[PDB]
Amino acid sequence: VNTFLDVVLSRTQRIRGFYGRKVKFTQDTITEKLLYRCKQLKRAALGRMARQHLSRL
């Protein structure tokens, strides 16, 4: 799961709107897979967010 989150982070990888698109795109890509104040909110969102038997039968 942690590797998948890292893979999702790797896949994911005005300024307020541009960061908002970055905030949306980074989370939406994780959702699809599943300035300082603005950057603090962006870090807060990331911080808060952060078969075999059948095949062998």
Partner: protein, 51 residues
């Protein structure tokens, strides 16, 4: 097929390669860290520090 087909087939140089890979793992990790660059370098450094 069915059930553990791979295990059944095996029962019915892998060790040497695994030993060579394990021995070379110590040098590979140091080389990878030295040759790492960009954001992946930070991720590799963070993973090594955590470990």
């Amino acid at each position: 097929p069915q059930n553990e087909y791979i295990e059944e087939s095996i029962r019915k140089d892998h060790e040497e390669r695994k030993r060579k890979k394990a021995a070379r793992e110590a040098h590979d990790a140091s080389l990878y860290a030295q040759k790492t660059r960009g954001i992946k370098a930070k991720l590799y450094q963070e993973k090594r520090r955590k470990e």
